[PDB]
Symmetry: C2
Subunit: 484 residues, 2 copies
Amino acid sequence: ELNDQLRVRREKLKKIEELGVDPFGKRFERTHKAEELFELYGDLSKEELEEQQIEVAVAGRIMTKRGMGKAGFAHIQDVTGQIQIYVRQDDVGEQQYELFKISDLGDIVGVRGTMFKTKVGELSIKVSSYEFLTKALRPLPEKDIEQRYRQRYLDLIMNPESKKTFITRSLIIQSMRRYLDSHGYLEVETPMMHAVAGGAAARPFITHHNALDMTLYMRIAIELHLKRLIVGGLEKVYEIGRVFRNEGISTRHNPEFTMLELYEAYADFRDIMKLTENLIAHIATEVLGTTKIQYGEHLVDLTPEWRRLHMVDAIKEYVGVDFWRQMSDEEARELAKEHGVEVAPHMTFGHIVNEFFEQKVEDKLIQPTFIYGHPVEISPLAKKNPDDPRFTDRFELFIVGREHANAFTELNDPIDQRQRFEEQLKEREQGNDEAHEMDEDFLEALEYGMPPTGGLGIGVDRLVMLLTNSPSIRDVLLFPQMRH
Amino acid sequence: ELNDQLRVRREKLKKIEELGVDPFGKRFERTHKAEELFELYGDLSKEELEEQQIEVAVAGRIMTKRGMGKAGFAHIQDVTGQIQIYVRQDDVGEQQYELFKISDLGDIVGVRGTMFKTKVGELSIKVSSYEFLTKALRPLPEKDIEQRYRQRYLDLIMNPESKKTFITRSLIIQSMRRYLDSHGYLEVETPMMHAVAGGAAARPFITHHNALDMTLYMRIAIELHLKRLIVGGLEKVYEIGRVFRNEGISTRHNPEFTMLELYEAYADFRDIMKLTENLIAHIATEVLGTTKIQYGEHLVDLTPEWRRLHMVDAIKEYVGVDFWRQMSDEEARELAKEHGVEVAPHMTFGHIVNEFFEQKVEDKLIQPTFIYGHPVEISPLAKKNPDDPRFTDRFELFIVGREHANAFTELNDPIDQRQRFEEQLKEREQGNDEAHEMDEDFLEALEYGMPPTGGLGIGVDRLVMLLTNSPSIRDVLLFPQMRH
Ligand SMILES: NCCCC[C@H](N)C(=O)NS(=O)(=O)OC[C@H]1O[C@@H](n2cnc3c(N)ncnc32)[C@H](O)[C@@H]1O
Ligand SMILES: NCCCC[C@H](N)C(=O)NS(=O)(=O)OC[C@H]1O[C@@H](n2cnc3c(N)ncnc32)[C@H](O)[C@@H]1O
Ligand SMILES: [Mg+2]
Ligand SMILES: [Mg+2]
């Protein structure tokens, strides 16, 4: 019992046809958004308004209604807010009034009429024509997170704070393309279906092309095709697009997410550090009007210049172990054991250094920080640091304790690039099933010559989380991937 | 005929290393692109250039090189074109001159020098500093059609007009979002991985998520989730994104392509017609400077307003057959036999009408034409025309004989929408594997009430082909799907 009123709504549908109305509407032209009427006419008195007879036409979903007698009111909601309509049978006539009376919460209508103020003072529209636009067969639920994510639409109608996050997300990506376009980076589109899933260390989604009878992998990264565009002489390219990773959900991961990948010939990772803080600072200024923002319990300062800290120096500062020292893989393992860092059988010194960083340091980096110099074994596409080849000129950007970007001075030496892949294939033998695969095609492109280049990848959803103060990626995705 | 070249290029690599240089270079700062040089200094006399000593720095790939002992020339190519450089041991010293002498066609280098003109009058750079940037292990090609899609980068380097097509492509997309954004449409991002592949008639790519253990379908359309947004009250939304259909390629089909879908609450298909022609004409204007373009042997006038033609009327016009009269399925079958129109076993009058249009008519549609009134049977998500429900208030945009867009007054009645789905399941039981699938989720969404709405889908690559006079979609994708 209770939802039996579903029969009541179903009933109200045929009655509307009997009134001779299309219960699902026709086009309806409007003159204004609810918020505009307030902004334009909110300060005119009841008298100045009857005086000016402003005609307007608006449409929206009925959120509240109080009829009775031969006149009633209702609050109608458009994407900008609600506006009260006053409907009297003496104005709209018998027929349209019956339509108003039979109208229910959830139903969508359009009206033409004049701006007016009741004796209570609430700006309203004194209706001259009432148009039924669409019958809601179910009532809007009673004002869980299951529903907000599984039925985003109800969340968007009932929770203004949620709809603004999505509008800001739009502004953020728009702001991003604007900066990137004005700085000469060419926007491009590369394949999301790959012969070989490469460009990152991740598990791919596998699919099949019936006609070509070929196995394809949804891309886990945009990197290798953008490098082919740098060999192509395109110099500055970027792509803000979807990438897919066959991994579980979390407050920071969605299997399909949005990544910005960007390449710039003749720059190195220090140049990309400057670009990354400037871009982001550009975006926060443009959308929030300030680079000082609040995220959860933190006051995060996005004002460039951001802190630069070598991964090894970070481990020294936050744990006290000094990996600058040349040591054997076993000594690294002993250290791991002593400090509670979990390590896998395919791991050697380099991987272990990164585990110390991930497991004991990461969550402590609240202010924007470029952690750089990642060990060569976890950076198969980055160029080795000329002074200490155990590390590469790579950096990751951390803020509020989490990874927001990855970037590097690109490895453009095909011989060295082929060896990194051989090293990865070996690791896969020892069980690292996220190790990159061989991609002969990519190697042959490199062999035609790729100029020294600086590359960058930003998790766009995570940046949006940060700039809208969303605790979870599920809050910045219209339709997050649900379990079950 | 041999890899002696590969070998000699490897030999030089060791040689430039033994000269103390990083054969894969470091960052390199530039002041100009070859293009701006010509634009700024192409008109200056040879002697005022000598007097002025205008210092510049540029970088690019060596396309031509001519020896002659202790002074040499080369043309280096950047993304804007090529500039001749003049290098003499006289000026740059022996170690840089040696670097220049080893440099091959294909290698990438940077130079600092002053502007000057040769006796011949050619604007050039008198090199003061020669930086070796990257060794190409593989020779640039000499001076087929499949080859260049297979190695787009070779094509981008050797063929000027080539990158142009892609630069135009990005300008076309950018111009589309600017128009859409300024007209109130909210750019959004909805799922590409679906529980049920819907929004179109097409076979999907199927994949699986390991952790969640679930079958996922790559989207074949953007429609169902944008419609959820319209139920959600957002009013105007659009998304320019990749879509996936598991079908063979053709000069107008790629398995992954870019579609623009947009929805507008309170509008109908006639409003979407006007939006479509104003949006496309605007893009041609903004990007090409004209609405008159060349495509193959045709001069297409994209200036509004375009021709509106009812599908049935088009059939009477080009075929001489009438379908306005009430007619039986068997009579439609007879007409088809008489006219050589192929029909399947599940087809009835409505499908047959569309088969007459597609097989005998659409290829004659050269100038922009809104063909409208598609039969209800082939339009499961469009609202029936009220005066004659055998047809729907839908249109497809044809230009140069090919479908560029699809649109309709949306079916927002959930009862009818469920019926259409059921009819689709029967057609499937009857051999139509393109039939739509039942999506209870989408239906639930409509039960909350979707306002009357006008929707639109535009094949973005097809639009790009049109405005760049590209005969195949493969000419506008940087990396088109290759056959094994
Ligand atoms: N050539 C220089 C590096 C370029 C980027 C490299 N190809 C890349 O993919 N690196 S990444 O760190 O693996 O991915 C980039 C970012 O995407 C974000 N990301 C990664 N996986 C997810 C998931 N699963 N959800 C949301 N966001 C994600 C996160 O901020 C990462 O910093
Ligand atoms: N709700 C109103 C209709 C919205 C669009 C609907 N969801 C849609 O998918 N229609 S479509 O006609 O099937 O696709 C839209 C356009 O995409 C283009 N398209 C379709 N398939 C391909 C392929 N495979 N390659 C390139 N372009 C394609 C073509 O121009 C179509 O007109
Ligand atoms: Mg990373
Ligand atoms: Mg179509």
